[PDB]
Amino acid sequence: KPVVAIVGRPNVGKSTIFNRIAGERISIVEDTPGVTRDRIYSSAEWLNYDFNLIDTGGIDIPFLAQIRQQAEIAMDEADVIIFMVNGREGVTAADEEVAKILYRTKKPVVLAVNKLDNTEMRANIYDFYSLGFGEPYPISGTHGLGLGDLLDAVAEHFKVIQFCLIGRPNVGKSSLVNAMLGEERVIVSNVAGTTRDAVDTSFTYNQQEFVIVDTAGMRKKGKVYETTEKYSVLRALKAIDRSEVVAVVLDGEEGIIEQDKRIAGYAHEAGKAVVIVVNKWDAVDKDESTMKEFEENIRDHFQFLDYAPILFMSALTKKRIHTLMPAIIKASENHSLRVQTNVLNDVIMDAVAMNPTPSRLKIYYATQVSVKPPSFVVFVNDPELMHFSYERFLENRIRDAFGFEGTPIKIFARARK
């Protein structure tokens, strides 16, 4: 499929153009550093029903070398490299520095000029012929002007389950993902906050395709009073809604932090399969009964989720990394499973017989409604008599009658009707 990439110095509204191409994916803010740290992928079409889009960060002379490397890598796969530049400020030395790479790149290049929001000063498309490229074009993300001609200029050169990953910042999420697909795809830095939004990639494993997304970490709500840079957290929360398997990552060197329990709450309340994951065993000791020290401690603190399997692996030394997916596939089935109506009812009155302590609440019927998560409805004389202690009791019996491992369960109650 065709590949198209956008490059240039920062603050030229590259991500703005990328978004109005389709939807709203990349975060759009106005500041010199607030650029997309790495490359992203998407799909597009204009009368060809087939195109792909790639967005990167700004290029200049903190960390900028990794962004430059990503921009260079994106220049490889792209068929045409839309090269967007400001119009109001004319040209710049950094523009020539950017143009040097394109000069050394033997691929077709289309030049575009942004910040042309009205007709009159649209006539400012001049002096860009010195760059050595073809005819420039006008575009404005605020009003979507000149889009058809630009897309025609691009066209003239025309030739599965999703699982997420969350956690508190600086626990190795980015290192874990790029040490798992085998290819440098996302950035890794010592300072917290390296990632700035969701990164999506697709891949096939054991003749099965998969989708993996990173979420740049999550910190406490109270102390997140940043300069709208926490606007990315909304993007991270969005990925959970589109994901169906959630991987929570905890550091092994550090103990269980209170914020980790809160983060795991969001996944549980979303009715999504969870697999608790811990990283960085290279720091703390690996020995006998050190397995159970954190294995037991997690159970004591993380009571609300017990179905989640516990996996240990360190991304730095790549120990037991290949064991992550075996957990994932098993969790995939249990989140979408139905049990027979006959069998499910037969188990219900066995539980209530040995515990005849429900006037007295009456159980009459039981069945399943949804596949994911497995919702069940029980017809009773009155749902007011239902007690949260007894409601939890029903869940344990169901979770013990069958496997139902690594997935939450919800029980609904209906009146006599």
Binding site: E89, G90, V91, T92, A93, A94, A123, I125, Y126, D127, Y129, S130, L131, G132, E135
Partner: protein
């Protein structure tokens, strides 16, 4: 090792020869926003200026001293040929057309652009006055006298400084190479 004076270097670039005395000046991109690139008429001062005048503006262009104006479009004569001569100026109406239709001014340094005072409605006043962050400026000849290049470098430096770029902070002066 020694930085000479202005009154000594004009008499000494007589001796650095009929050659042309030119000035380099290192400016102080970061500052591209307030960059320093430009042209000004000169005091102590052969070109061939060809104009792209449109409408009535050709009628005052043929009497000021220009060599060839045109038949309102000779970019087709520019295509496959066109030994360009000295200087290309234009007017703010056909510039957009000449820019797109003309595809031979980028790496040749004659593309009309109204940032330089060369694309305007005053074509009669424009013919008569033309005849990494660095600026080059020809101020004159070897055969000029000692009092000519002093006013020439004074006018060009006052033009540079008159234009004290925004973000004036930090040193503005780095080097003068006569």
């Amino acid at each position: 090792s020694k930085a000479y004076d202005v009154s000594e270097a004009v008499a000494l670039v007589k001796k650095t020869n009929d050659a042309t005395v030119e000035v380099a000046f290192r400016l102080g991109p970061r500052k591209n926003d307030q960059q320093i690139r430009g042209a000004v008429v000169l005091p102590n001062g052969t070109q061939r200026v060809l104009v792209f005048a449109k409408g009535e503006k050709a009628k005052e262009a043929e009497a000021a001293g220009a060599d060839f104006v045109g038949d309102t479009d000779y970019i087709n004569k520019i295509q496959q040929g066109w030994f360009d001569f000295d200087v290309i100026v234009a007017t703010p109406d056909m510039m957009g057309e000449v820019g797109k239709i003309g595809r031979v001014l980028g790496p040749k340094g004659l593309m009309p652009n109204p940032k330089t005072g060369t694309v305007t409605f005053e074509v009669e006043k424009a013919i008569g006055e033309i005849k990494a962050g660095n600026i080059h400026v020809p101020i004159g000849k070897v055969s000029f006298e000692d009092e000519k290049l002093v006013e020439n470098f004074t006018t060009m430096y006052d033009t540079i400084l008159k234009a004290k770029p925004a973000a004036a902070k930090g040193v503005y002066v780095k080097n003068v190479a006569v």
